[PDB]
Amino acid sequence: AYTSHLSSKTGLHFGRLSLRSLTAYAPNLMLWGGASMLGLFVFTEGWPKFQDTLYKKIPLLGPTLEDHTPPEDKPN
């Protein structure tokens, strides 16, 4: 036929960020969240509270981190 009008909606946006760009970006945002969580798992490894809660629960690297000094050669 013949089309006289261009039918379009105005999208959803907050000036710069669009909903379309947010949905296109969101899984890589989840990947960056996971990458930053691995970065915190690196830079908090020596923390013995995070070792006790998290890193000693690991199967192959968990009992590796804990020490085996008896309470006879520890001064405190």
Partner: protein
């Protein structure tokens, strides 16, 4: 004394030497000077007072 533990002697082994020496305690209720058998946290004492 506590740094000797785990290098050359055991914990109960260093506690006996630290108890064999004597150090200055906090003064008693009447303010008199008081001595005390040592613990791990003390230092190895020299033979001469000055």
């Amino acid at each position: 004394w506590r740094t000797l533990v785990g290098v050359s002697h055991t914990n109960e082994e260093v506690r006996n030497m630290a108890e064999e020496f004597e150090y200055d305690d906090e003064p008693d209720e009447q303010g008199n000077p008081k001595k005390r058998p040592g613990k791990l946290s003390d230092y190895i004492p020299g033979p001469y007072p000055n």
